[PDB]
Design goal:
The protein has 257 residues and is α+β, with helices and mostly antiparallel strands. It is built from seven helices and 14 strands. The strands form three sheets. Strands 3-4-2-1-14-13 form a six-stranded mixed sheet. Strands 5-6-7-8-12-9 form a six-stranded mixed sheet. A two-stranded antiparallel ribbon has the order 10-11. The longest helix is centred in the middle third of the chain and has 23 residues. The structure holds manganese (II) ion (2 copies). The site of one manganese (II) ion (MN) has 2 residues, from loops.
């Protein structure tokens, strides 16, 4: 068994100022994937970039203090890829694809579309390039795990306000339709393997008591390819965990090598 946590951290220093290292120690995952780091390693306290028992890998954006993803793992991957080979997606610190030996791990921070019509086109194409990349890899024979902030609630059950947000980026027909197609390409949203209840979200707005009122979205997912789903034992939501506007999400898989 391998324990993997994904977490949009809303800035790595920001969360560190709120008990990140304590939490990380009590959870002891085998792999920790983080999104929205907002820093380069050289701007990070040394105790955030070197954690005992773990190996760190950082993928910052061209722009400083913007997005970027990180990976901590007890055992290091044989290599990391930091893009899809399409540069307008590869430079924003959004892609980490770590090759462990029993599987690939996609640590992805998918773009937000709310900003503008431009950023919507960008998010959707990012979705396409992503589909293309992941599909090439598993058709070639690789078992894949994809985690991270998709910035889209799949279904009505996956947010508190479907009706209100039918025309807001995050719950548009196009965006949810992409996830349907994603799943049609042979991929399973693992949480829904184990949990079919409503009121299960991973993000809440910092404003107007949204977390206390459970007015939230499920933006963070763990996907596996179909032919690998037998190996997943647990997919759950760490909703007690504070320190970001997202909470972390967990996966456990069984394998040898
Ligand atoms: Mn944020
Ligand atoms: Mn987000």
């Amino acid at each position: 068994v391998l324990k993997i946590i994904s977490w949009n951290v809303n800035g790595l220093r920001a969360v560190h100022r709120k008990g990140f290292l304590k939490w990380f120690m009590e959870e002891k995952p085998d792999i920790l994937c983080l999104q929205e780091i907002k820093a380069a390693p050289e701007q990070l306290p040394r105790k955030l970039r070197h954690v005992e028992g773990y190996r760190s890998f950082f993928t910052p954006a061209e722009r400083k203090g913007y997005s970027g993803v990180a990976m901590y793992t007890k055992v290091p991957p044989s290599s990391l890829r930091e893009g899809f080979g399409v540069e307008r997606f590869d430079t924003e610190g959004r892609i980490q694809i770590a090759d462990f030996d029993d599987f690939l791990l996609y640590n992805i921070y998918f773009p937000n579309g709310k900003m503008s019509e431009e950023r919507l086109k960008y998010k959707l194409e990012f979705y396409d390039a992503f589909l293309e990349d992941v599909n090439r890899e598993r058709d070639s024979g690789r078992n894949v795990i994809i985690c991270g902030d998709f910035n889209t609630a799949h279904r009505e059950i996956d947010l508190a306000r479907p009706k209100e947000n039918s025309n807001v980026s995050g719950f548009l027909p196009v965006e949810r339709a992409w996830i349907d197609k994603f799943i049609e390409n042979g991929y399973v949203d693992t949480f829904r393997m184990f949990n079919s209840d409503p009121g299960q979200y991973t993000w809440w707005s910092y404003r107007t008591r949204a977390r206390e009122r459970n007015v939230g979205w499920r933006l963070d997912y763990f996907f596996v390819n179909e032919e690998f789903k037998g190996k997943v034992k647990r997919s759950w939501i760490l909703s007690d965990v504070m320190g970001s506007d997202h909470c972390p999400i967990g996966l456990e898989i069984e394998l040898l090598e």
